[PDB]
Design an enzyme around this catalytic site. Structure first.
Site, mmCIF file in Angstrom:
data_model
loop_
_atom_site.group_PDB
_atom_site.id
_atom_site.type_symbol
_atom_site.label_atom_id
_atom_site.label_comp_id
_atom_site.label_asym_id
_atom_site.label_seq_id
_atom_site.Cartn_x
_atom_site.Cartn_y
_atom_site.Cartn_z
ATOM 1 N N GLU A 1 -10.486 10.593 7.255
ATOM 2 C CA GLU A 1 -11.109 9.381 7.775
ATOM 3 C C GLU A 1 -12.152 9.676 8.838
ATOM 4 O O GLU A 1 -12.979 8.811 9.129
ATOM 5 C CB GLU A 1 -10.059 8.442 8.368
ATOM 6 C CG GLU A 1 -8.937 8.115 7.426
ATOM 7 C CD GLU A 1 -7.890 7.253 8.098
ATOM 8 O OE1 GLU A 1 -8.075 6.015 8.123
ATOM 9 O OE2 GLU A 1 -6.894 7.816 8.608
ATOM 10 N N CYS B 1 -2.043 1.172 2.607
ATOM 11 C CA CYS B 1 -1.792 2.108 3.705
ATOM 12 C C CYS B 1 -0.972 3.283 3.195
ATOM 13 O O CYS B 1 0.173 3.108 2.761
ATOM 14 C CB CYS B 1 -1.078 1.444 4.889
ATOM 15 S SG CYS B 1 -0.573 2.623 6.168
ATOM 16 N N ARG C 1 2.675 4.619 5.313
ATOM 17 C CA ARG C 1 3.765 3.687 5.553
ATOM 18 C C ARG C 1 5.124 4.355 5.694
ATOM 19 O O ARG C 1 6.090 3.660 6.013
ATOM 20 C CB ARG C 1 3.822 2.644 4.442
ATOM 21 C CG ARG C 1 2.777 1.544 4.599
ATOM 22 C CD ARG C 1 2.891 0.564 3.457
ATOM 23 N NE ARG C 1 2.271 1.113 2.245
ATOM 24 C CZ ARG C 1 2.416 0.600 1.029
ATOM 25 N NH1 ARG C 1 3.171 -0.474 0.835
ATOM 26 N NH2 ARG C 1 1.791 1.181 -0.007
ATOM 27 N N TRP D 1 -2.173 7.280 13.874
ATOM 28 C CA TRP D 1 -2.899 8.526 14.051
ATOM 29 C C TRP D 1 -3.723 8.815 12.801
ATOM 30 O O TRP D 1 -3.446 8.307 11.715
ATOM 31 C CB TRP D 1 -1.984 9.713 14.325
ATOM 32 C CG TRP D 1 -0.859 9.895 13.364
ATOM 33 C CD1 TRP D 1 -0.904 10.511 12.142
ATOM 34 C CD2 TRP D 1 0.500 9.489 13.559
ATOM 35 N NE1 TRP D 1 0.341 10.494 11.554
ATOM 36 C CE2 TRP D 1 1.222 9.882 12.412
ATOM 37 C CE3 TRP D 1 1.182 8.839 14.597
ATOM 38 C CZ2 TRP D 1 2.582 9.631 12.269
ATOM 39 C CZ3 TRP D 1 2.535 8.591 14.452
ATOM 40 C CH2 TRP D 1 3.222 8.993 13.299
HETATM 41 C C1 HEM Z 1 0.709 6.186 11.654
HETATM 42 C C2 HEM Z 1 -0.187 6.823 10.886
HETATM 43 C C3 HEM Z 1 -1.074 6.065 9.860
HETATM 44 C C4 HEM Z 1 -1.796 6.684 8.936
HETATM 45 C C5 HEM Z 1 -1.803 8.217 8.774
HETATM 46 C C6 HEM Z 1 -2.504 5.680 8.154
HETATM 47 C C7 HEM Z 1 -3.372 5.886 7.094
HETATM 48 C C8 HEM Z 1 -4.140 4.893 6.532
HETATM 49 C C9 HEM Z 1 -5.338 5.062 5.713
HETATM 50 C C10 HEM Z 1 -5.994 6.413 5.311
HETATM 51 C C11 HEM Z 1 -5.769 3.852 5.337
HETATM 52 C C12 HEM Z 1 -7.019 3.598 4.462
HETATM 53 C C13 HEM Z 1 -8.014 2.779 5.272
HETATM 54 C C14 HEM Z 1 -9.418 3.272 5.099
HETATM 55 O O1 HEM Z 1 -9.636 4.299 4.405
HETATM 56 O O2 HEM Z 1 -10.319 2.616 5.677
HETATM 57 C C15 HEM Z 1 -4.874 2.848 5.913
HETATM 58 C C16 HEM Z 1 -4.951 1.478 5.778
HETATM 59 C C17 HEM Z 1 -4.171 0.514 6.431
HETATM 60 N N1 HEM Z 1 -3.129 0.778 7.314
HETATM 61 FE FE1 HEM Z 1 -2.350 2.595 7.728
HETATM 62 N N2 HEM Z 1 -2.182 4.429 8.670
HETATM 63 C C18 HEM Z 1 -1.300 4.630 9.728
HETATM 64 C C19 HEM Z 1 -0.753 3.640 10.531
HETATM 65 C C20 HEM Z 1 -0.732 2.289 10.364
HETATM 66 C C21 HEM Z 1 -0.091 1.290 11.248
HETATM 67 C C22 HEM Z 1 0.671 1.633 12.568
HETATM 68 C C23 HEM Z 1 -0.340 0.075 10.704
HETATM 69 C C24 HEM Z 1 0.109 -1.336 11.136
HETATM 70 C C25 HEM Z 1 1.137 -1.530 11.985
HETATM 71 C C26 HEM Z 1 -1.105 0.296 9.474
HETATM 72 C C27 HEM Z 1 -1.562 -0.639 8.598
HETATM 73 C C28 HEM Z 1 -2.597 -0.439 7.721
HETATM 74 C C29 HEM Z 1 -3.344 -1.488 7.082
HETATM 75 C C30 HEM Z 1 -3.101 -3.002 7.248
HETATM 76 C C31 HEM Z 1 -4.266 -0.928 6.295
HETATM 77 C C32 HEM Z 1 -5.267 -1.749 5.449
HETATM 78 C C33 HEM Z 1 -6.680 -1.382 5.881
HETATM 79 C C34 HEM Z 1 -7.706 -2.264 5.217
HETATM 80 O O3 HEM Z 1 -7.340 -3.111 4.356
HETATM 81 O O4 HEM Z 1 -8.911 -2.111 5.550
HETATM 82 N N3 HEM Z 1 -1.330 1.622 9.340
HETATM 83 N N4 HEM Z 1 -3.904 3.536 6.624
HETATM 84 C C1 LIG Z 2 -3.438 1.608 12.348
HETATM 85 O O1 LIG Z 2 -3.587 3.010 12.367
HETATM 86 C C2 LIG Z 2 -4.394 3.554 11.390
HETATM 87 C C3 LIG Z 2 -4.400 4.922 11.240
HETATM 88 C C4 LIG Z 2 -5.216 5.479 10.257
HETATM 89 N N1 LIG Z 2 -5.220 6.815 10.102
HETATM 90 N N2 LIG Z 2 -5.980 4.700 9.466
HETATM 91 C C5 LIG Z 2 -6.009 3.359 9.587
HETATM 92 C C6 LIG Z 2 -6.903 2.575 8.637
HETATM 93 C C7 LIG Z 2 -8.092 1.902 9.314
HETATM 94 C C8 LIG Z 2 -9.244 2.839 9.630
HETATM 95 C C9 LIG Z 2 -10.155 3.198 8.641
HETATM 96 C C10 LIG Z 2 -11.214 4.055 8.939
HETATM 97 C C11 LIG Z 2 -12.213 4.447 7.878
HETATM 98 C C12 LIG Z 2 -13.614 4.249 8.447
HETATM 99 N N3 LIG Z 2 -14.482 3.675 7.411
HETATM 100 C C13 LIG Z 2 -15.629 2.996 8.029
HETATM 101 C C14 LIG Z 2 -14.977 4.753 6.553
HETATM 102 C C15 LIG Z 2 -11.376 4.540 10.230
HETATM 103 C C16 LIG Z 2 -10.469 4.179 11.216
HETATM 104 F F1 LIG Z 2 -10.620 4.654 12.466
HETATM 105 C C17 LIG Z 2 -9.412 3.331 10.917
HETATM 106 F F2 LIG Z 2 -8.542 2.989 11.884
HETATM 107 C C18 LIG Z 2 -5.199 2.755 10.562
#
Ligand code: HEM
Ligand SMILES: COc1cc(N)nc(CCc2cc(CCN(C)C)cc(F)c2F)c1
Ligand code: HEM
Ligand SMILES: COc1cc(N)nc(CCc2cc(CCN(C)C)cc(F)c2F)c1
Ligand SMILES: C[C@H](O)[C@H](O)[C@H]1CNc2nc(N)[nH]c(=O)c2N1
Ligand SMILES: C[C@H](O)[C@H](O)[C@H]1CNc2nc(N)[nH]c(=O)c2N1
Ligand SMILES: [Zn+2]
Lengths: 411, 410
Positions: free
Chosen positions: A285, A108, A111, A280
């Protein structure tokens, strides 16, 4: 033992000692690296030490390690485990665990925000209708009329694996996808399988292009039930471009709130199988992945066609050019409508600051370079040059199998 | 034991069995993955023979003579030579095989579909830096081929006891000089600031331009290194212009056509070749994304965006991204107009996906380092982005080695 990571753009070298608290496997060995591989009930036997380790972390964080309160909590948990084969978290422990699961999410990039998580305790929920209410209130709170607020809603923990709470959607808000008889796809190609499950569960599909899917909600191991999110709660943004007037005519829009709902939250050995969390968007994405993936809305061609690009040979980089323009439009649209979004340059810069701060006060910051580097323009962001160590800390978010593959239907 | 790799764009799933013949260490454990770490932070007669046997075993297997008269005889012959001399020498056929397969096994190399077409130049009879210079000139001329680039490697004498090492001190055979300014910025190429000074620190006469081709600094048999200037008619360069913006030429940019790595170590059957310059042809992003637009390189990003009159106040305008694309269109257009070989990142990654399928089919695997295979721009619109890859070390291999100015006793 002390490990070192170097930033190759700034020659800054950091020292990781947090990896010594690493627990479960990475999947790698001395002879194989699985760093680009996407994927990998509990007895009192192995639950005791999982709870103890969590409580040791918890009471260390509040500066009460070895206190009478720490020892009484240990004794009270272990008594509850041996007499009931599980235990209940206090509110304070639950909030701590959810925040630290996020703080530990090595994939993530967002973070830096981990400590500002709103935690909604839904452990008193008992029915799918109750889940619907809890999720509606989450979406309303998190959305906040475009001033998005990170949040998580935690439903009851697993017991014997036959009474799971599950949200069958992969995200709370997502567009339907319909495979046509001629082979083409209407809507979001990524959601075709789930859209069919919904239609088979009785969803009357409008068969439009941007249909928000219903929530499919499972409580206490019962068959899941369909609920429609009230449309006034689903905030959406029409996509337009600041220079290309024709971009609006593609008719595109995207929802404001990214909310992951299919993952498993692990805290002190306890498994919370329904725990939707939301933040957000990073612009890429939506614009790199949600339209321009060969397996998504594939407006990539249309944008190129309307820019009048050379689409004959790939070396004109027409794909790269249209990819940039779509990402400009997504960011422009969200900002114009005052809906929270971050571009990949700001998010990666913030993550490096977070990562350095974490090495200072925590001894390390587990990070998955394969997922942290953005899907476009990688080497002009500061994480590209950043060496990163990847290891698993708990509490943690984990993948779990799709529920339709494991569910035993009641009928 | 029979591991699976999935492509998430196509659902194709390949089974890797080749990794079971892996050998050296990845750097990872079950507790920590070092897949994003850049670097891994003589042979005795007992260490040497298993290495040779392993190599000879895979060599005689590849020619379908495993366990044959020639195999056992050769096995015995090398056994005797090692017991005697505390090293051994490769037959020309083995040397060629070893080099092609060190390329085939380079997990960070996207260009490996071409691995069997390598031209191997045996320079093991070289004794002096002038000789090295001659061999390197001939390599450059052959590889350049008037723009019709051809893969080549030149292999100098192997290490013996560490005292008599052959080393090319340049990191690449052809690189632009870089000089630090008496006030702030940098002229030329900042990556080469130390090297560009080590040359004058030895006797170079820097023309003090931006794009001054560095001299070769060749070390033979362990003696002090010597400066040599590559005849400029051997250095093919491409002027960089854009197929649209005519102010692009005004920038006055150019780049050399021949990417030629010269600071790595080649390991075949336990033997170590410390001087083994190899060359192919550029992927376009290696020049424009990295050589021009890195902060600590040419960093003309701002200039190009400024001449495009893009809003450069907020990062969310993606002005860097926009400029980065146009610069890489120009590089490709320029090379292609001048009939100098180059591949774009879309073609190279597609070719690599095909190469992977070929390797899993006819070999059972293909070690690959996703962190290096994914291009530094437009990553997710290329087929390798969604391709799971398994990384492991096979031999023969190319390895890093320390910079000789720390090692050499001057
Ligand atoms: C608040 C703004 C946040 C942004 C800008 C953000 C951004 C991202 C991005 C770009 C990814 C890559 C996932 C992908 O490309 O599919 C990711 C993964 C992830 N995020 Fe964050 N995220 C946010 C919030 C959060 C929150 C609130 C949580 C949990 C409380 C969280 C937990 C995770 C987890 C567990 C992953 C792993 C996704 C996976 O393994 O498929 N994120 N995040
Ligand atoms: C928990 O809050 C989050 C905020 C942000 N920005 N990203 C994530 C990662 C999880 C996440 C990944 C993707 C990528 C879509 N693939 C199919 C290409 C779309 C999402 F809509 C989404 F939610 C979580
Ligand atoms: C013919 C066209 C070739 C192309 C397009 C190509 C492409 C690439 C690219 C883009 C990289 C990334 C390295 C970096 O970004 O610094 C790389 C790495 C590498 N390539 Fe290839 N290559 C080619 C030929 C060769 C040949 C002929 C050899 C050896 C005989 C070779 C061996 C390697 C090795 C060892 C690496 C790893 C470099 C390192 O670890 O720093 N390549 N290649
Ligand atoms: C042997 O043949 C090869 C062919 C190609 N295309 N690349 C290499 C890797 C060596 C190499 C890599 C890069 C990457 C860009 N950096 C500025 C970060 C630039 C080079 F200038 C160079 F020389 C070898
Ligand atoms: C820290 C990171 O491992 C480092 O910057 C790597 C990332 N990937 C790369 N990929 C290529 N092709 N070339 C590189 O130099 C690097 N550098
Ligand atoms: C095969 C590869 O691991 C897979 O496609 C990963 C690579 N990196 C990614 N990075 C992000 N941010 N999101 C993804 O879905 C993926 N997918
Ligand atoms: Zn690893």
């Amino acid at each position: 033992r002390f490990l070192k990571v170097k930033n190759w753009e700034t020659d800054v070298v950091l020292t990781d000692t947090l990896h010594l608290k690493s627990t479960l496997e990475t999947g790698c060995t001395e002879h194989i690296c699985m760093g680009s591989i996407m994927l990998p009930v509990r007895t009192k036997d192995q639950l005791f030490p999982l709870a103890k380790e969590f409580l040791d972390q918890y009471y260390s964080s509040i500066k009460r390690f070895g206190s009478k309160a720490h020892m009484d909590r240990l004794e009270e948990v272990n008594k509850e485990i041996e007499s009931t084969s599980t235990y209940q978290l206090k509110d304070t422990e639950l909030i701590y665990g959810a925040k630290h699961a996020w703080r530990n999410a090595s994939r993530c990039v967002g973070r830096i925000q981990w400590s500002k998580l709103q935690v909604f305790d839904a452990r008193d929920c008992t029915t799918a209708h109750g889940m619907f209410n809890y999720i509606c209130n989450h979406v309303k709170y998190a959305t906040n009329k475009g001033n998005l607020r990170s949040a998580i809603t935690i439903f009851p923990q697993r017991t014997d694996g036959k009474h799971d709470f599950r949200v069958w959607n992969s995200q709370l808000i997502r567009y339907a996808g319909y495979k046509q008889p001629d082979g083409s796809t209407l809507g979001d190609p990524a959601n075709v399988q789930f859209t069919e499950i919904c239609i088979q569960q009785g969803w009357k599909a409008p068969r439009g292009r941007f249909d928000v899917l219903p929530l499919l909600l499972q409580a206490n191991g019962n068959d899941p039930e369909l609920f429609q999110i009230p449309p006034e709660l689903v905030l959406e943004v029409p996509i337009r471009h600041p220079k290309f007037d024709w971009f609006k005519d593609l008719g595109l829009k995207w929802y404001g709130l990214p909310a992951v709902s299919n993952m498993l939250l692990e805290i002190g050995g306890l498994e919370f199988s329904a725990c939707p969390f939301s933040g957000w968007y990073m612009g890429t994405e939506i614009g790199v992945r949600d339209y321009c993936d060969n397996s998504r809305y594939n407006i990539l061609e249309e944008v190129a066609k309307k820019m009048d690009l050379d689409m004959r040979k790939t070396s004109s980089l027409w794909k790269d050019q249209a990819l940039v323009e779509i990402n400009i439009a997504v960011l422009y649209s969200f900002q114009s409508d005052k809906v929270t979004i971050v571009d990949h340059h700001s998010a990666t810069e913030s993550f490096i600051k977070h990562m350095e701060n974490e090495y200072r006060c925590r001894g390390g910051c587990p990070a998955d370079w394969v997922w942290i580097v953005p899907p476009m323009s990688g080497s002009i962001t500061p994480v590209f040059f950043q060496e990163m160590l990847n290891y698993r800390l708990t509490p943690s978010f984990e993948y779990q199998p799709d529920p339709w593959n494991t569910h035993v239907w009641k009928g």
